[PDB]
Amino acid sequence: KLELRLKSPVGAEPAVYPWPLPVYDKHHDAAHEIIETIRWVCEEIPDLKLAMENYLIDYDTKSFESMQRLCDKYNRAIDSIHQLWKGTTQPMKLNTRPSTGLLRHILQQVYNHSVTDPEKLNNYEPFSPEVYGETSFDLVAQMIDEIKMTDDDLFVDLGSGVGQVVLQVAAATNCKHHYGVEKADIPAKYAETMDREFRKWMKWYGKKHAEYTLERGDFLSEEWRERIANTSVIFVNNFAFGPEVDHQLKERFANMKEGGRIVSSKPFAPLNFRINSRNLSDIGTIMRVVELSPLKWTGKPVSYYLHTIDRTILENYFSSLK
Ligand SMILES: C[S@@+](CC[C@H](N)C(=O)[O-])C[C@H]1O[C@@H](n2cnc3c(N)ncnc32)[C@H](O)[C@@H]1O
């Protein structure tokens, strides 16, 4: 039937949209996704922005003719750019990581295409570890900015939901591998589509990401004990996990390497920890804990906390006993 098509700037399969264009939520639709996609491509390729600068128009997101018209202007401009690249003009640099602004758009696009019924993520057992909530792009970006990962680092989102934390980190850092592990059926199911849509859109934009895997599973399992021990950066949105789950996580953290880091929405050790002869076995003895600077109280997880595995604290206490 009626179709809208956007050509890829790097010659991947065109993106196809049905008419009428679908709505995602109260503030997101396919019409606007299309217009923003064109805008971001224009950001990627200055030549394209030029052509699009030359013969802007009153887009009626209501009108098919109008939307087909705008898509045509973009597709024609993409054709001419590809011809330009056949001449002397340098083509778009391949396999670079997306800009922060492009990444935000890509992840929203992937989410809207994969999470078909968002309401279904609220079907959890309340007052349980299953409680769903998403860390915002802005907080994830802060975590990336401040905890600096290198190609030596291994990153894991414990309880990864639909996987959008892991995708953002895979696109912004050069870790060897990123993992997400999610237990609940509904988000784990959506994460499978998120995985596919992300790999497809990233290829469409011609942008690179690191290796990652989104898995279904229980991060408290026997298998996961050793995986946690060998992870250098743990992200865990544990605000609603409870004391029992946190206690079990502490036990698994106590096997992590020196300099390992844990980012969480509820501290695993009090910020003002001081070693004495009664707390000698508390996880607080082997880590520093700092509250990440707030981004400029509600009831929902807002603040996040960085834990760094530092055994010199325990060592020091013993040297002082001598
Ligand atoms: C608040 S959500 C966090 C989603 C995502 N990591 C984020 O921050 O945007 C917490 C997730 O942890 C999951 N979870 C709880 N216990 C788990 C377990 N034992 N193993 C794997 N996932 C678990 C829940 O199913 C839930 O989807």
Q: Judging by beta carbons within 10 Å of its beta carbon (0-12, 13-18, 19+), is residue 65 exposed, middle or buried?
A: exposed
Decide: 134 in ligand 1 pocket, CB within 6 A.
yes
Token pair in block for residue 2: 């009626």
Question: Which of 120, 38, 23 is closest to 76 using CA atoms?
Answer: 38
Q: For residues 149 and 177, what is the distance between their CA atoms, to the nearest angstrom? A: 11
Decide: 180 in ligand 1 pocket, CB within 6 A.
no
CATH number at residue 243: 3.40.50.150
Same domain as 118, residue 175: no
Same domain as 152, residue 239: yes
Question: Which of 156, 276, 135 is closest to 214 using CA atoms?
Answer: 156
Decide: 159 in ligand 1 pocket, CB within 6 A.
yes
Q: For residues 161 and 42, what is the distance between their CA atoms, to the nearest angstrom? A: 32
Q: Determine if residue 158 is labeled as part of a ligand binding site.
A: yes
Which ranges of the chain would DSSP assign to H, the alpha helix? 30-44, 46-53, 64-84, 100-114, 137-146, 164-172, 185-205, 222-229, 243-253, 312-320
Same domain as 161, residue 54: no
Last residue of a domain, one of 122, 152, 167: 122
Q: Which phi and psi (to 5°) does residue 128 adopt?
A: -145, 165
Q: Which phi and psi (to 5°) does residue 266 adopt?
A: -150, 125
Domain count, the chain: 2
The distance of Cα 249 from the centroid of its chain, to the nearest Å, equals: 22
Method for this entry: X-ray
**In the beta sheet, which residues pair with residue 264?**
236, 305
Question: Which of 286, 290, 288 is closest to 315 using CA atoms?
Answer: 286
Residues near 264 by Cβ (< 8 Å), separated by ≥ 6?
Answer: 234, 235, 236, 237, 238, 304, 305, 307
Decide: 132 in ligand 1 pocket, CB within 6 A.
yes
Which atom of ligand 1 is nearest the CA belonging to 180?
A: 6
- Overall resolution, Å: 2.1
Residues near 148 by Cβ (< 8 Å), separated by ≥ 6?
Answer: none
Same domain as 188, residue 151: yes
- How far CA 162 is from CA of 108, 191, 220, 243, in Å, comes to 12, 4, 19, 24
CATH number at residue 9: 1.10.260.60
Cα torsion 259, 264, 269, 270: sign: positive
Question: Which of 192, 196, 153, 191 is closest to 172 using CA atoms?
Answer: 153
Asked whether residue 222 is assigned to any structural domain, the reply reads yes
Q: Determine if residue 16 is labeled as part of a ligand binding site.
A: no
Q: Which phi and psi (to 5°) does residue 178 adopt?
A: -120, 145
Which ranges of 54-99 would DSSP assign to H, the alpha helix? 64-84
Give the helix, strand, coil percentages of the chain, each rounded to 5.
Answer: 40, 15, 45
Last residue of a domain, one of 92, 122, 152: 122
CA of 88 to the centre of ligand 1 (A): 51
- How far CA 38 is from CA of 8, 26, 79, 89, 268, in Å, comes to 10, 22, 14, 21, 44
Considering only CA atoms, which residue is closest to atom 22 of ligand 1? 159
Same domain as 297, residue 193: yes
Which ranges of 230-299 would DSSP assign to H, the alpha helix? 243-253
Decide: 265 in ligand 1 pocket, CB within 6 A.
no
- Provide the 10 A C-beta neighbour count for residue 244: 9
Same domain as 241, residue 181: yes
Residues near 170 by Cβ (< 8 Å), separated by ≥ 6?
Answer: 178, 209, 210, 211, 212
DSSP states along 165-198: HHHHHHHH---SEEEEEE-SHHHHHHHHHHHHHH
Angle in degrees, CA 190, 196, 200, rounded to 5: 140
The answer to whether residues 205 and 10 touch, using CB atoms and an 8 Å cutoff, is yes
Asked whether residue 6 is assigned to any structural domain, the reply reads yes
Same domain as 202, residue 77: no
Residues followed by a break in the chain, C–N over 2.5 Å? 55, 296
Looking only at the bridges linking them, the beta strands covering 233-236 and 154-158 are parallel
Q: For residues 212 and 178, what is the distance between their CA atoms, to the nearest angstrom? A: 4
CA of 150 to the centre of ligand 1 (A): 25
Considering only CA atoms, which residue is closest to atom 12 of ligand 1? 159
Asked whether residue 127 is assigned to any structural domain, the reply reads no
User: 3-class SS at 293?
Assistant: coil
Q: For residues 153 and 235, what is the distance between their CA atoms, to the nearest angstrom? A: 13
Decide: 130 in ligand 1 pocket, CB within 6 A.
yes
* Probe target for ligand 1 pocket from 111, 115, 122, 130, with the most ligand atoms within 8 Å of CB: 130
- How far CA 62 is from CA of 16, 19, 75, 87, in Å, comes to 18, 11, 20, 39
Q: Which phi and psi (to 5°) does residue 290 adopt?
A: -135, 145
Same domain as 189, residue 101: no
Asked whether residue 129 is assigned to any structural domain, the reply reads no
Provide the domain limits for residue 95: 1-122
Q: Judging by beta carbons within 10 Å of its beta carbon (0-12, 13-18, 19+), is residue 176 exposed, middle or buried?
A: middle
Token pair in block for residue 232: 């250098």
Decide: 249 in ligand 1 pocket, CB within 6 A.
no
Same domain as 196, residue 87: no
Same domain as 214, residue 274: yes
Same domain as 151, residue 113: no
User: 3-class SS at 29?
Assistant: strand
Q: For residues 125 and 44, what is the distance between their CA atoms, to the nearest angstrom? A: 44
Decide: 242 in ligand 1 pocket, CB within 6 A.
no
